[PDB]
C-alpha cells in the first residue's frame, strides 16, 4: 500500500529559452566611444604644449651659458 | 552511457516472443528511466565534443550537476552505472519511498 504517486505539488520548470538583458544597443553605443576618445585628445595640447614650454626652458639654460 | 535504454531494446525484443504485455505500473518506470538516459547522452554528447575542440570549462560546469543523477541509479537498482535492472518480466523491484519529491526537486 506504500507506493509513490503524490497527490499534488508540481511546477513545472520551463522549457523556455530567453534572457534578453540588453544592454544599451542601437546608436547608444559608438557614442560613449567617440566622446571619450576626443576627451583623451582634449587632454593633449594642455600637456604636450605645456611640456613644449618647458622644453624651450630646458634649452634656455644651455644657450645662456657657454660663452 | 545508456543503462536503461539498453535492456529496453532487449526485454521488448523478448516479450513479443513470449505473448506478454507488461503490467501498467511497470510501463511508467521504463518511460521514466528511458527518458532519463537521454539526459545523460545529450550532456556527454556536447561536453566531450567541446573538449576535443578544446574548451575546458563546459566540461566541469555540467558534470558537477551530473552527480545529482547517479544517486538515483544507486538508490533504485544496484550500483553506479551498470544495472541489471530491466528484466524480461518487467521491472525487477519497486523504487523505494522517495524518488518523487527528488526527481521533481531535480527537474
From Swiss-Prot, chain A:
Q: Where in the cell is it found?
A: Mitochondrion inner membrane; Nucleus
Residue stretches spanning the membrane: 24-45
Role, per record: Accessory subunit of the mitochondrial membrane respiratory chain NADH dehydrogenase (Complex I), that is believed not to be involved in catalysis. Complex I functions in the transfer of electrons from NADH to the respiratory chain. The immediate electron acceptor for the enzyme is believed to be ubiquinone. Involved in the interferon/all-trans-retinoic acid (IFN/RA) induced cell death. This apoptotic activity is inhibited by interaction with viral IRF1. Prevents the transactivation of STAT3 target genes.
The entry describes its oligomerization and partners as: Complex I is composed of 45 different subunits. Interacts with CARD15, but not with CARD4. Interacts with STAT3, but not with STAT1, STAT2 and STAT5A. Interacts with OLFM4.
Q: Which family does it belong to?
A: Belongs to the complex I NDUFA13 subunit family.
Can you say what this protein is called? Answer: NADH dehydrogenase [ubiquinone] 1 alpha subcomplex subunit 13
The record lists the organism as: Bos taurus
Q: Which residues of the full protein are shown?
A: 7 to 73 of 144
Swiss-Prot record, chain B:
The organism's superkingdom is given as Eukaryota
Q: Where in the cell is it found?
A: Mitochondrion inner membrane
- Which family does this protein fall into? Belongs to the complex I 49 kDa subunit family.
Q: Any idea what job this protein has?
A: Core subunit of the mitochondrial membrane respiratory chain NADH dehydrogenase (Complex I) which catalyzes electron transfer from NADH through the respiratory chain, using ubiquinone as an electron acceptor. Essential for the catalytic activity and assembly of complex I. Redox-sensitive, critical component of the oxygen-sensing pathway in the pulmonary vasculature which plays a key role in acute pulmonary oxygen-sensing and hypoxic pulmonary vasoconstriction. Plays an important role in carotid body sensing of hypoxia.
Can you state the subunit structure given in the record?
Answer: Core subunit of respiratory chain NADH dehydrogenase (Complex I) which is composed of 45 different subunits. Component of the iron-sulfur (IP) fragment of the enzyme. Interacts with NDUFAF3. Interacts with NDUFAF7. Interacts with CERS2.
UniProt protein name:
NADH dehydrogenase [ubiquinone] iron-sulfur protein 2, mitochondrial
> What organism does the record attribute this protein to?
Bos taurus
Which portion of the complete protein is shown here?
Answer: 142 to 248 of 463
